[PDB]
Design a protein around this motif. Structure first.
Motif, PDB file in Angstrom:
ATOM      1  N   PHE A  35     -40.955  -8.425 -86.873  1.00 36.95           N
ATOM      2  CA  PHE A  35     -40.461  -9.255 -85.721  1.00 36.95           C
ATOM      3  C   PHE A  35     -39.416  -8.694 -85.053  1.00 36.95           C
ATOM      4  CE2 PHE A  35     -43.680 -12.265 -87.404  1.00 36.95           C
ATOM      5  CZ  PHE A  35     -43.438 -12.071 -88.805  1.00 36.95           C
ATOM      6  N   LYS A  36     -39.584  -8.846 -83.689  1.00 36.75           N
ATOM      7  CA  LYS A  36     -38.128  -9.027 -82.809  1.00 36.75           C
ATOM      8  C   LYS A  36     -37.811 -10.185 -82.307  1.00 36.75           C
ATOM      9  CE  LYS A  36     -38.702  -3.948 -81.418  1.00 36.75           C
ATOM     10  NZ  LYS A  36     -37.483  -3.555 -82.226  1.00 36.75           N
ATOM     11  N   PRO A  37     -36.637 -10.620 -82.391  1.00 32.32           N
ATOM     12  CA  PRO A  37     -35.837 -10.138 -83.251  1.00 32.32           C
ATOM     13  C   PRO A  37     -35.933 -10.343 -84.897  1.00 32.32           C
ATOM     14  CG  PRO A  37     -35.099 -12.196 -82.363  1.00 32.32           C
ATOM     15  CD  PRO A  37     -36.276 -11.965 -81.746  1.00 32.32           C
ATOM     16  N   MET A  66     -39.665 -21.149 -81.722  1.00 31.65           N
ATOM     17  CA  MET A  66     -39.156 -20.154 -81.141  1.00 31.65           C
ATOM     18  C   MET A  66     -40.312 -19.299 -80.702  1.00 31.65           C
ATOM     19  SD  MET A  66     -35.741 -19.552 -83.340  1.00 31.65           S
ATOM     20  CE  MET A  66     -34.223 -20.589 -82.951  1.00 31.65           C
ATOM     21  N   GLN A  67     -40.074 -18.461 -79.377  1.00 37.00           N
ATOM     22  CA  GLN A  67     -40.963 -17.495 -79.100  1.00 37.00           C
ATOM     23  C   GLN A  67     -40.779 -16.064 -79.799  1.00 37.00           C
ATOM     24  OE1 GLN A  67     -40.749 -17.430 -74.940  1.00 37.00           O
ATOM     25  NE2 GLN A  67     -42.693 -18.634 -74.759  1.00 37.00           N
ATOM     26  N   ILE A  68     -41.425 -15.359 -80.560  1.00 34.47           N
ATOM     27  CA  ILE A  68     -40.781 -14.327 -81.242  1.00 34.47           C
ATOM     28  C   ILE A  68     -42.117 -13.125 -80.747  1.00 34.47           C
ATOM     29  CG2 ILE A  68     -40.762 -13.232 -83.589  1.00 34.47           C
ATOM     30  CD1 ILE A  68     -38.550 -15.569 -83.120  1.00 34.47           C
TER      31      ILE A  68
ATOM     32  N   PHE B   5     -38.092 -16.280 -75.951  1.00 35.34           N
ATOM     33  CA  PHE B   5     -38.002 -15.004 -76.585  1.00 35.34           C
ATOM     34  C   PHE B   5     -36.657 -14.371 -76.149  1.00 35.34           C
ATOM     35  CE2 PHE B   5     -38.328 -10.431 -76.291  1.00 35.34           C
ATOM     36  CZ  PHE B   5     -38.261 -10.215 -77.848  1.00 35.34           C
ATOM     37  N   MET B   6     -36.286 -14.040 -74.762  1.00 37.86           N
ATOM     38  CA  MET B   6     -35.219 -13.471 -74.633  1.00 37.86           C
ATOM     39  C   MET B   6     -33.856 -14.273 -74.855  1.00 37.86           C
ATOM     40  SD  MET B   6     -35.355 -10.301 -73.615  1.00 37.86           S
ATOM     41  CE  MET B   6     -33.646 -10.390 -72.997  1.00 37.86           C
ATOM     42  N   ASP B   7     -34.013 -15.577 -75.128  1.00 44.65           N
ATOM     43  CA  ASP B   7     -32.835 -16.504 -75.568  1.00 44.65           C
ATOM     44  C   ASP B   7     -32.861 -16.019 -76.887  1.00 44.65           C
ATOM     45  OD1 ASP B   7     -30.970 -18.389 -75.510  1.00 44.65           O
ATOM     46  OD2 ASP B   7     -32.368 -20.106 -75.762  1.00 44.65           O
ATOM     47  N   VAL B   8     -33.584 -16.395 -77.650  1.00 45.10           N
ATOM     48  CA  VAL B   8     -33.690 -16.000 -79.335  1.00 45.10           C
ATOM     49  C   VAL B   8     -33.027 -14.627 -79.385  1.00 45.10           C
ATOM     50  CG1 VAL B   8     -35.110 -15.625 -81.174  1.00 45.10           C
ATOM     51  CG2 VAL B   8     -35.872 -17.266 -79.450  1.00 45.10           C
ATOM     52  N   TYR B   9     -33.546 -13.622 -78.762  1.00 44.28           N
ATOM     53  CA  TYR B   9     -33.291 -12.235 -78.966  1.00 44.28           C
ATOM     54  C   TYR B   9     -31.850 -12.007 -78.579  1.00 44.28           C
ATOM     55  CZ  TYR B   9     -33.212  -7.178 -77.936  1.00 44.28           C
ATOM     56  OH  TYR B   9     -32.453  -6.073 -78.155  1.00 44.28           O
ATOM     57  N   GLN B  10     -31.155 -12.570 -77.533  1.00 41.30           N
ATOM     58  CA  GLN B  10     -29.569 -12.220 -77.387  1.00 41.30           C
ATOM     59  C   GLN B  10     -29.111 -13.028 -78.224  1.00 41.30           C
ATOM     60  OE1 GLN B  10     -29.043 -11.750 -72.716  1.00 41.30           O
ATOM     61  NE2 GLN B  10     -30.962 -12.964 -72.894  1.00 41.30           N
TER      62      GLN B  10
END
Lengths: 95, 95
Positions: A35-37, A66-68, B5-10
């Protein structure tokens, strides 16, 4: 300068705190995807109790979606929704 | 609402985050005593690097002083100052 005792005490006592949680810990049966993140920010119980024989644990909890980025190594990757448990309320209970 | 996704990632990415740290862990030579609170709020590197060979580690550190109740069970107790390590900056490095 010096953080005052009652400030330390109140800030550290058992309560939900943003905790960076490994997705594999949440999905311990997953053996196909990576998975990312690789971790997600979740509210989880943390901190200490008045009595060292107690542990800070949830008394109310609910899921967040959450979108993963779900990756199958050497095949592809897809944005998908995954649910994660958050802790809404915490109490000190026996270890 | 679904977290994008980009919110989770950051938000999950390697950075200093408030972490509740047990005092005994920091100071294993403090056998003789009990502390209140038993844990303290400290900025520490947390989060993910999204390369399982990389981990999130401090590159800048500093100390903070806090007032902590030191207890000799059923004998006495005193508010004194204790110093703890914090992380000011983090980076993703090889394990």
């Amino acid at each position: 300068e010096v953080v005052k005792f009652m400030d330390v005490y109140q800030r550290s006592y058992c309560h939900p705190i943003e905790t960076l949680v490994d997705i594999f810990q949440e999905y311990p049966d997953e053996i196909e995807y990576i998975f990312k993140p690789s971790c997600v920010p979740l509210m989880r119980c943390g901190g200490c109790c008045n009595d060292e024989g107690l542990e800070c644990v949830p008394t109310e909890e609910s899921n967040i979606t959450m979108q993963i980025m779900r990756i199958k190594p050497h095949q592809g990757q897809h944005i998908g929704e995954m649910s994660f448990l958050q802790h809404n309320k915490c109490e000190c209970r026996p270890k």
